[PDB]
Structure formats: C-alpha cells, structure tokens
Amino acid sequence: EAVVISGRKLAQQIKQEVRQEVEEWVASGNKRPHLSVILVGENPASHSYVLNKTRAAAVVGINSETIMKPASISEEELLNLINKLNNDDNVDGLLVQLPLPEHIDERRICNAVSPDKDVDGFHVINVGRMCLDQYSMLPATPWGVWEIIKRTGIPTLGKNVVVAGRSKNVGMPIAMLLHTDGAHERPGGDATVTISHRYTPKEQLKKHTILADIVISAAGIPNLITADMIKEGAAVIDVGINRVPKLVGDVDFEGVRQKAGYITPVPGGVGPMTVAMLMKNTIIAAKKVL
C-alpha cells in the first residue's frame, strides 16, 4: 500500500527551521522580517490562502500585513501601492496574490515588485535566473514540490518524471527544477522530464506516465491521474486543487493509493508546503542574501 506523504507534517518542520533562523537573525541585532501581501477582490480561495500565509508568518516570527483592495481598483493605483511598498524600508518581502482582475496586466504587476522583495519569484529577472540555474527566489509551489521529493528521500537523478501542466508559475518551474544539473549554482534534480499540457492527448499522457517514476500533476482537472496510468511503486504528487461540496486534487486518490508507492493528499499535501517555502523566501529576502 502507498505511503501517504503528509504535507502538513513536512511544512511543520520547514516552518520550525524558519522560526529558528529568524530568531537567530533577530537575536544578533537585525530587524525582524516583515512580509506585505497585497490582495485584490474577493476570490474566496485567494483570501483563504492569504490567511494561511499570514498565520504562518506570525508563528515563525515574521511580521506581516495584508493590504486588501477592491476588485475595481485601477492598474495605476496598484502600481502606486506597489511602488510605495518597494520604498518602505520596513518591508522585506512583497507579493501580490493572483489571480488579478481581467483589466489589470498581471505581468506588469509582477515586474513592478523590486526583485529583492520578490518572494514569489515572479519578476522576470527571477524567472530568467531560475531558468539559468542561478541563485534566485524560487516560486513557492514549485519549491514545495521539490522539498516534498527531497525530504521524503525520493531519488530523481536519472529517473523519469512527467509534469502535467505548463503554467509559468507552477508547471514550467517544476519541470525546470527537476531536469536541471545537480552541480549548478541552484541545483536541479537531474531527472528526465516530460512536459504535457492541454494539447497532450490523454492516450499520449498514459504512454509517458506508465514510464514515470514520479508523476507530478499541476493541471487542475479532477481524476486526470488514474491507476492504469501509473506504474507500480511510482511517486505521485498532486499540485492541482479542485472543487467538485468537496475538495480533491488532480489524482484519483483512492485508486492510485493502491497502485502507487507514494502519494500526496489534497488538502494537506502541496498546499501547506507552498506556505512553508514562502516563509523560507521571506527570511532569505530579509537577509539580502541576493
């Protein structure tokens, strides 16, 4: 039967590392880290995820504030607010929660956060440095998927991996982290990564996943990963979070639970790892390590 990897317990340890690093940093004379979160509108999942992020900040010793603005805000007003925070010497990390209303250019907003405060890793310089295997702020969900793999001890070097999805914030960074060189400034997993997306016929997904030692699902389709697509003993990691009055991942949990070696549940899987790795990035930003 498949080990159900506990995302809640792993994030507990990571957060414990952070609250210790933060306390050593404060004890030796430095400012306590501060994270600002800008939240636009009333997406219930957004508010819920921002709340998780600020609860986690408080219990690791990081100060935080959530600036909530109505969905009717103009792009120029958001860019003013971003620029004021970029110049607030108290603020170490600044992130704008996505998605943003249709009339606001998301990519303009992301590049307007100064890269030293860009704990999300969404600024184009952070994306480019990540893609060159340089030291960077790693985006939180891809770094969480990576930490799930590394702390569970699942090998990646020379192994086959399939990512479902190519979004610039989740799927593509996961694929980048997993195929790249262990020896580089920012190490990678040295795996053999296949990238599928909305134009991958399901038949051809199955022919690649049966070869996969690690299937990573970040598409947002319920029941996309089913037991006949996974080989015996493979690790399956569910980034998708779907509402079907219930919440489920992209994997068919019960069926793949029999077939797989490892699996991550939804909720309680990658979710709390996203919040944990954002805490790492905030203290990294407070140190001006980069």
Added chain:
Amino acid sequence: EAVVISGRKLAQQIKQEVRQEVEEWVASGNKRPHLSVILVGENPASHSYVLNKTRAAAVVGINSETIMKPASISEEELLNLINKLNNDDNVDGLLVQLPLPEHIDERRICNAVSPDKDVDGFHVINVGRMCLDQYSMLPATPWGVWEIIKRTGIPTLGKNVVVAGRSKNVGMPIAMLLHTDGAHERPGGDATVTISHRYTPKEQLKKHTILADIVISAAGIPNLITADMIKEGAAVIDVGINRVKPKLVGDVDFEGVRQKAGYITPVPGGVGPMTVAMLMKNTIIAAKKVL
C-alpha cells in the same frame, strides 16, 4: 528513404530575405546595420563559426567586424570593451562568441551586452522573457531549429518531441519553444516535450524517442541517435557537431537513421548554417529597435 532537409539551402533563402529587408531599410534613409563579434582565444571551431557569421553579414549587406582578443585578457578588460560597443551608435548588434576562458564569467559577460544590441538572446532579460513566452530576441540555434520545423511543414501541436541536451544556450530554449502555447505573444509548438541529458540512461532515452514524432539531438555524442531509437516516419534534427583522418559528424547515425526517419538534417550543412541565418534576422531586428 528519409527526406534530407538542406539547412544550407534554407539558410541561404532566409539570408536573401534579410538582404532585401536591409536594402529597404537603407533605401528608406537609415544607417546600414552593423554587427560586432568579439572573439576570445583560438578555439578553431569558434574561429570557423565567427568567420561564417561575418561572411553571412557581408552577403546580406550588414557591416561587420570581428574583434579578436587573447585568452589571457581579464574579465574587466572584456567589460570595458563591451561597454565601449554598447555606447557606439554605429554598432547595432553585439555578440561575444562562447565558450569563454574559465576566468571569465560567461553570465556576467552576456548580461553586460545592452539588451537592445543582444542579438544572441543571452541577456537574462531576454531569457526571462522567452521563458514567459513574451516577445524577445530568440537565440539563434534554437530559432534555426524552429524554422527548420516550421518551414518544412512538420507539425508540432500534440506531437511528442524529445530533446537530447539541456544546455541553456541550445537544448533548454529548444524545449521551451516547442512545448509552449501557440496563442501567447511569442507562440510555441504546443508539443509534448521530453528533456534528456547526461544522466538519462541510454535505455530510458530509447523508451522515449520511440514515441517521438520529432527527435532533436543537441548532446554532442557521435552515434547517440540510432535507427532503432526512432519510430517510422519521424523527423530527426541533428544539432550536434562532433569531430571524429579528421571528419565531422552529428549526434545522429546519419546513414542508419536515414532509412527509418521521415526527415533528417545532415551534419554539416544542417542546423549550423541555420544558426548563422537567424543571427542575421536578429541583427536587422535589433538595428530597427523593434523590441
């Protein structure tokens, strides 16, 4: 037998289009374009390739110069020279031929080239924008691989593609272009892409290539790709150039794969000349200050 795609022929066509675009740019009352290539050291492959670039410049009506420096120059001296050329209004495109000596940080050098003169697409901003499917200077060899595919009508949407190699200048951009969305600012191929590299076990590589409608080899390994790894009718594009009496071959077993592939590029006369052609396109793009 397989259709052999002549990269030499396609590149000379494209050079012709660039030439017409330059003459019109000049006839409209604009400065003739100028490309500067910086060459460090005496790698003979590097010298041969820069010579091919400056020849193509002359053919398409672009002024050029190669500035050769000994390998013993310092990083600071290269940056002084690069800053000089960034500030020369006569200079439209500027590239530093890779690889550089171990004491020169390649990353710092590529980021030192003004992004508007960055005809290699190597500046971290161009890399970042390419990886977000924004408009950017595409690097030359990946763009040549893309043109070979598109100008031959070889379809990519929903197809399986395997890239052998993951270098930031060649294999990674090729895999980024091929797997990304046709509907974004800079369109992608919408393919299903597998990236293999030096730790991919040869038997596992084979288990992917057999599903592949396109195989692209940028590993630098003679006879890496052999006819039993390829499915029938597939396209096989040989990015590698290996020296193996001295002879030049690709990563692909040309004669063997010739029999099962639907398409194939030769080495030499394949991707190489396409690299030089797309650099001419990027230089007229840079001269026009379009990005």
